[PDB]
């Protein structure tokens, strides 16, 4: 229609269970500034293993928008509902 919203795959450099968080951005960008952000993501290694919504690069390439990663990193499994075999 107009501009699409920016949704990439991004390394994510630590011991967190995944190795690749899928991100996106809060605002529509042209398709042309998708492939170039996804350039920067390639340079990219995110190591922080969070919630949802979590901001990564603020105003990345000096555009103004958020690229915020949508998946949950688990990166301490502790699962305290069963004790162990």
């Given at each position: 229609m107009h501009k699409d919203i920016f949704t990439s795959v991004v390394r994510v450099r630590g011991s967190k269970k995944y190795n690749v968080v899928?991100?996106?951005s809060n605002?529509?960008?042209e398709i042309s500034?998708?492939?170039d952000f996804s350039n920067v993501?390639?340079?990219l290694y995110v190591g922080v293993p969070t919630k949802?919504?979590?901001?990564v690069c603020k105003n990345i390439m000096?555009?103004?928008?958020?690229?915020?990663?949508?998946?949950?990193?688990p990166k301490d499994s502790?699962?305290?509902?069963?004790?162990?075999?």
């Open positions: 899928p991100v996106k605002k529509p960008v500034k998708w492939i993501l390639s340079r949802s919504g979590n901001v000096n555009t103004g928008v958020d690229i915020i990663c949508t998946k949950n990193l502790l699962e305290h509902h069963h004790h162990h075999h």
